[PDB]
From a paper:
This cofactor promiscuity enhances the pathogenicity of S. aureus by enabling it to survive the oxidative burst of the innate immune system while experiencing host-imposed Mn starvation. Each monomer presented the characteristic fold conserved amongst Mn/Fe-SODs, with an α-helical N-terminal domain and a C-terminal α/β domain connected by a loop. The active sites were enclosed between the two domains of each monomer, with both domains contributing ligands.
The crystal structures of Mn(Mn)SOD and Mn(cam)SOD were determined by molecular replacement, using B. subtilis SodA as a search model, at 2.07 Å and 2.30 Å, respectively (data collection and refinement statistics are provided in Table S1, ESI†). In the S. aureus Mn(Mn)SOD, the ring plane of H26 relative to the Mn–Oδ1,Asp167 bond was 180°, while in Mn(cam)SOD it was 167°. The 94 GHz ELDOR-NMR and ENDOR of Mn(Mn)SOD and Mn(cam)SOD are remarkably similar, indicating a high-degree of structural homology even at the level of the positions of the protons in proximity to the metal ion, in particular those of the water ligand.
Author numbering:
A (entry chain B), B (entry chain A): 2 to 199
Write the structure that this text describes.
């Protein structure tokens, strides 16, 4: 079966950047729902031992009647599992990935500005991503729970702009939630993922 | 220029089904933003003296540089303007439209079940609609601020499932927000719109 992972920190550990209450709802309700529904779709079938990453990367091969749940719920499970891992109460802007961001964008701020502009203009529900595409870093958006693996790119950092991720604290002020996020990136995890995918 | 309409009731009039605070944010912020952006696009142009309905119905004829905003923001303005008018502090399940719903679905409950099922399975941001299509009633969904006029169908009832419409009160429990909505449909307004579009 797929399983809800435990958070690697306390629910209040990311205050004030993400409120405690949001982490409760977001992890115990929204993420738990993606998992439950995903299992309802695949259990008792020959897909029950297939990797999430492989199914997302090859949605076209998923059977037509299971595809929407695998896309949406499987997306939801992959994307939130990664999201918890790339957040940290001890963010230090260090690693080989940071050096390569500087090299490509000039400064860390230039990267943060391109990412922020894409996150804040993303219309509706979705995610902003840093990906490796061939050897190169790039920033992309996806709608809903869509995932750049489907397009042959490897994710190493992601930011949730579904309204449930920021409404309780920030309401409509999504740019303030963007600016907050930078303080809680687990750049260490981003770097591991980056070294593996270049 | 387009104008943010006044609510036709007090901000607390839909309590306890929709909290006062949500109506403040939803109307004074989210809807106001769609209008502002809409006007930034169309003020000083041909389109400022065109009906919103006609423009959304023929998005493809909107000039390339304006089309995205007219879709998203014009959609946002149309959709929320209608939404306030189809809510009522005294919802009574009365009108000729309900007689034709019974005729097509058997009972009002069968219609409510098909509508609920479509609203609750709509993935991401969007709207669930009752429309007339060529004489017949049908229930459809759209993503984000898309609108069935664009596909040649006339809307008479709509339900906002963007998470900003329900997060403060219901958080993740969108089915409880559906069940609550039935107690606040202005079926009288739905019926006027239906009589016009038959
Ligand atoms: Mn989320
Ligand atoms: Mn809305």
């Amino acid at each position: 079966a797929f399983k809800l992972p435990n958070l690697p920190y306390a629910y209040d550990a990311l205050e004030p950047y993400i409120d405690q209450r949001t982490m409760e709802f977001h992890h115990d309700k929204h993420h738990n729902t993606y998992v439950t529904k995903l299992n309802a779709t695949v259990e008792g079938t020959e897909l029950e031992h297939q990797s999430l990453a492989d199914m997302i990367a090859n949605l076209d091969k998923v059977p037509e009647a299971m595809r929407m749940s695998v896309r949406n719920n499987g997306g939801g499970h992959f994307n939130h599992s990664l999201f918890w891992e790339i957040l940290s109460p001890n963010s230090e802007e260090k690693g080989g990935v940071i050096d390569d961001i500087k090299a490509q964008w000039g400064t860390l701020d230039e990267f943060k500005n391109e990412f922020a502009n894409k996150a804040t203009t993303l219309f509706g529900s979705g995610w902003t991503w840093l990906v490796v595409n061939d050897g190169k870093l790039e920033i992309v958006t996806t709608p809903n729970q869509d995932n750049p693996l489907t397009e042959g790119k490897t994710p190493i950092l992601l930011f949730d702009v579904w309204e449930h991720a920021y409404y309780l604290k920030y309401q409509n002020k999504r740019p303030d939630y963007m600016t907050a996020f930078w303080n809680i990136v687990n750049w260490k995890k981003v770097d591991e993922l980056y070294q593996a995918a270049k």
